[PDB]
Design a protein around this ligand. Structure first.
Ligand SMILES: [K+]
Ligand SMILES: [K+]
Ligand SMILES: [K+]
Ligand SMILES: [K+]
Ligand SMILES: [K+]
Ligand SMILES: [K+]
Ligand SMILES: [K+]
Ligand SMILES: [K+]
Ligand SMILES: [K+]
Ligand SMILES: [K+]
Ligand SMILES: [K+]
Lengths: 173, 173, 173, 173, 173, 173, 173, 173, 173, 173, 173
């Protein structure tokens, strides 16, 4: 799995591949791993099971609702519950969330990670290949966030056997 | 075990073999791995223990009763319970459910999987062999869902040591 | 890797994918795994390292030369040396060889092996997926051996994470 | 794999199935597990790798050449080498050898086993099922060695997932 | 343990050995593993602890009472409670029950199971040895069900280290 | 640990050693592993922790009280609870109980074991050495139950590194 | 396996059971584990493979020959070679040797063990059960060495699942 | 991670690196692991997730408030809640807190701990490298606490693969 | 470790980081992992021990010498020996070699890998991060091979905890 | 095993227990583990097999002969041969040797070692218990070396399950 | 164990502690881990078995004799033998060697490591603590090589449980 997000010139993009694997075989090649949340104002990408994703995206929306739409505050609150609720502790996954203000990785191990100054985030088994390609592109070209995400996902798809080249890409605004 | 499902021309078929292997021997040879649930409106097949499967089938029917018979919603709700409940987490198996609208694989690891455009799903140790044969037949012949399921189960049976030639094939007219 | 061979209507075809993997990552995606030997009269596919393949193919040619083009006798002697010499025993590659008369699989651990009446052979991690698709196509369509190999390689490349869709296909017309 | 040997009324028969399983799939289905050695005066069957077996069969014939064709002496000498040689210790398998006087199982763990008064020997994952059926038939019917071997192999085949219905049966008239 | 049942010429027999093992040692050699239930009309054999058996047999009787002697319905309900209750789920015993109409195996993990056309059933570590001997005897002799069970138990007791030769055999004449 | 019981000429004795070990060292060498229960009418020996013993002896007394002092009935009831209560399932141990009528071993794995006709029972790591010596003495001498228990515990103490020679022996009446 | 030796009133006996096991099943039930060596002047019992036994008994005879028939000296020399020869180090087993002067256990771990004052030795998985019974008999009866060996082997056979009751007993003189 | 604190000549300093790792890769290199609490009067460093840290620091502030700035009492109560609540017990972070009076380490497993006479404290995988460098510098130079923390963090960052050289250093002048 | 090679506009470059690690700590941070061979006409990078590197670079030079300086031929010959020589088989590592004609990865598992059409190769734990960045740069910028190698090594150094930023870069010509 | 030596007031004593264990059972309880060498002038204790000890002691004598009774030089040469010869390297015994001048421990892995100012040495699994008791007795009582060794062996025999209380004690008056 | 080497102002010092730990206890406390080799012109220290170390030291001196006393060449040659020789591969340890020109670490895993510009090397479980302290002292004081080594060994000793305060420090004037 590869999910990568880039923010450039007032645009933020989150994109992912479509491969769901079981052991060394492919169960599905067109999964949609990126969704729009909170009245389409938040982009969310997940590396993990769909049902697991629904439970966590559901709660994150409840956090946004009670926390005035503050991404960081909502993210920290989600992480706290995910880290301590006996039910949620069974959900193994990683998430990337982004809104018009900032981008974050949320984990189930009590961490919420902000990006470096280049504003790029990536998760999944192939995430670091997209991250490497994205940083190269951001630091050496004028390409748009959308174009970098597309090119980075492709590079990750050609290296990671668990990442394919069937992408789902969401942009905001 | 091999369970395969094909949907074509308004017909939905789910079938499986009959071999139950204990250790590396044939425990039973005429198991019934596909069943009709929800007043005969749902087909369900399982790869795993018979007792475990019956437990999950009953729970799924309760989810269907709860969510107006909507398959995807019910499957996601079952996957969530399966993922967190102490007793259900001890239940090892994979499920295929199908009604007149859609087909899904349900897992105990937080995944609910929809088929690709071919509308085929397969599970079990021999699942991928039936999947390969079914995809070849759907894309290259005019055979019916029933015929493809029978022919795919037979091909899987000649390759997988744990898959039988004694099939139970159920269809939703 | 997936290498598959089909013989139909006087045509024999051997084709393979192009992925070379190290762990769960791809080192090369355009590998040619099928070669023409014995001045074009023999098609040879291999799952394994290129150095191993070069060694085994050069040794195989030598044998074909001294057995005046007899594939089976040449293969039987190859397998004999393979299990005899401590140097060759270190080679883990798997091979498929085919001429206008017959098709065979040769490995260092299982000596020589012939196909069933359908004359399909497959090796590599994705082999059985290709085999399942090929058997379905031979038994249910009038497709040529080339068409079947191309379609079976594709089906396997869509299921096996170690097999890709960049194929090299050779045919003995 | 199932190899079984029965001696009755001056006839000595050794037979086996034809299934070679790679992982948990049918690698090959028509293997020849029983062979005639020593100018056709010895029958030998093996449970394990084909290459490994051929290596041990060749070594056994050299032992027979060395010890005037005496089966027990040669088997003990083979067992000793198999037990200590660096390369042979890597060879995993069990063997059954039989001539017109006696039958023996040879192992790589320092054992040479003679049959009980029933004069029956069996090896392989399905060996004990064939052993049970053969003992029942020798003690309760007047069937010949050949018939008992065929019927015992078939019974083992319905129980052991790794045993085939394609037999090679050799007899010493 | 080895429990085996054969039905022939209007006679049904269930018999078992008497060894109770803890690790690789024998705690008891004269255990009675076959009992007469439902006032003598039902033969029941079990592989497992005596406390577990007492629990399951008392529960089975209750069901036979409310199902007016119907073995299958009683067994199906037994298996339902077995997988339903957390208390019963802890019971790992395996059972064989037989009346003048039919013979069945019941386990906590595989629910209820019926025999093949030969009407032989077996459970316990030595079960398959008894099954192999019994199938050979049914298919090749005119022996009574009692004779076959006695001879099959003996063959299994001579192969399985956890089965002995002190048998308890019950017959429904 | 070694606990052994012999019943001879109207006398029943239960005795045990005094060693409590942790890993390969001795924590205590004078533990009292045999106690008198039910108004001194029942002898009880335990292989396991003291607190574990107290919990189980406590419950067994409650069983005797509600089951009219019937040892077998009380033992089966204790085993059922021990086998299924989530709390009791954590207690790992074995027990021997004896009254003026009979002797029994109670386990936490759903079994209650009665002695062979020689009326000797033994548990603990050294139990089978005392059992061997006891059977030799019972079958070949006229020694009293008390003397055999004492001599058997001593023999076990000289063989098992986890059994010592500091005994606690209770007799009834 | 159980081999036990007792020396009483000028007679020394070595006896063993006949079971050869592979995993949890019996390969042979009438093996002869005790032999007479050195012109019938030495008794030898072995727990291990037959071929392994032949190699070691062969060398021990060579030691006797060059060491004037001195058992202890010959035993220590055999142990030294067994402990250090790369070939012999592969032989896993234990031996008991006895002559008219003394009895010894020889191991492959650089040890030669003399008996306690009771002059009883035992090896094999069931050896300590025969040892316990033998010591009880020697210390409490007037039975002959032969009778004690026979009764001890029987007691071990009823406890150890890897020891049977088919004995081979040799006496000297 | 490496967090280290040194107190010298009325100055207390706490500093840490900025690497956040997941497995053997870096998720972030500019993390701020040292924060100013209690309106600037308390320096706090942490090894662990940011969500965990936010939780523990908010809880610590609350305690400082009710203990009127008493670091030790506040830390002791923090550690009490940490091991008491099942929610907090899931938090694995390690903390270092320091005010103008004293410096302490607090963890969920080891409660509160104070420094040795040199007043150096360190946590994180690289902690002991920083501690070793700091002890050498305190005992052999006149360097300020700030200089020592900066130099010790650098030495640790050059040895530990999970610690980098992007430091955040806070001082209480 | 990260070694990466790019060939662009008649220039070929091989560069690597300087970190040598033992477990999770750094043994050396300025290792030179790229050398010039064959009279400075060949560039060689290695991921593995220095002594191991010297042995293999030494042999590769011997191959060049006897094979007229043909890189591919020399590489295949080195791989064959490395794959089969008992001494060389102990050397675990990966190598990249380049001359004015082509670039290759040589492994000890019988493989020699040529680059894709972009002519980029990379090995080491961080190799795929440099590979991702290099491909992004080659496909989207006009930067020189030297500049891409430098920027790619840097990106890999910021992600892989086992790769640092102390580079050694060689260019040809 | 426990061997301990104490030197006090011109007396040196070496004593050991008598237990020989195989796994968790006792093969012999009256072993003599301390011997007088060099015509009575050297006391030698050993933890290990008797064959190993015979080998090492005969080799040690030879060295004492050529070093005219010099214990240290003889021991240093012994240790040299021990780690030099592939035959001797297989010997795992541990030794303690003492003469009227000094006491030393010699092992195949740690060469020669001398005692601390208290002149106590101990080897064997129970060694450190004897050492702890001996150090307490030397530092706090006026007891003779013989009394201390006897009392320390007893304390160790009461704690270590592999050490018994049948001691052999030798003293150089 | 902690061995550390520092070179400064023409002085080269190698030192180590004296603790040898067997299991988790202090086997010996005054080991001599640093030795002078090659006619006193080379200093060598080891982390690992004493016997193993002495074997490697002897072999190194032979390499020095072979290569005109050149340290690096000799170290690389030793590393090559250590890497491939069957017996030497069983030798677990790390070495530090130093002469008047250079210092190196030699490993059995194909590595020969030179120090960074600080000219410091350290090995052993406590090596990195001594390394940290030595680097702090070399970069921030004017202490001599000898003083830094002693002070670094002491700091390591307060942190590593396996490192002593009894040092052997050798220097090359
Ligand atoms: K991919
Ligand atoms: K099958
Ligand atoms: K693929
Ligand atoms: K089968
Ligand atoms: K048995
Ligand atoms: K004991
Ligand atoms: K037995
Ligand atoms: K670092
Ligand atoms: K790094
Ligand atoms: K003891
Ligand atoms: K220490």
């Amino acid at each position: 799995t590869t999910i990568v997000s880039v923010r450039r010139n007032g645009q933020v993009v989150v994109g992912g591949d479509g491969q769901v694997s079981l052991g060394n075989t492919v169960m599905k090649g067109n999964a949609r791993k990126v969704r729009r949340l909170y009245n389409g104002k938040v982009l969310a990408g997940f590396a993990g099971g769909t049902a697991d994703a629904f439970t966590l995206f559901e709660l994150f929306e409840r956090k946004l609702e009670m926390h005035q739409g503050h991404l960081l505050k909502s993210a920290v609150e989600l992480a706290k519950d995910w880290r301590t609720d006996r039910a949620l502790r069974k959900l193994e996954a990683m998430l990337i969330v982004a809104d018009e203000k900032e981008s974050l990785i949320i984990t189930g191990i009590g961490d919420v990670v902000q990006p470096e100054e280049d504003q790029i985030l990536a998760i999944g088994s192939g995430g670091n290949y997209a991250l490497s390609a994205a940083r190269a592109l951001v630091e050496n070209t004028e390409l748009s966030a959308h174009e970098i995400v597309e090119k980075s996902l492709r590079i990750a798809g050609d290296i990671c056997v668990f990442t394919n080249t069937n992408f789902t890409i969401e942009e905001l605004p």
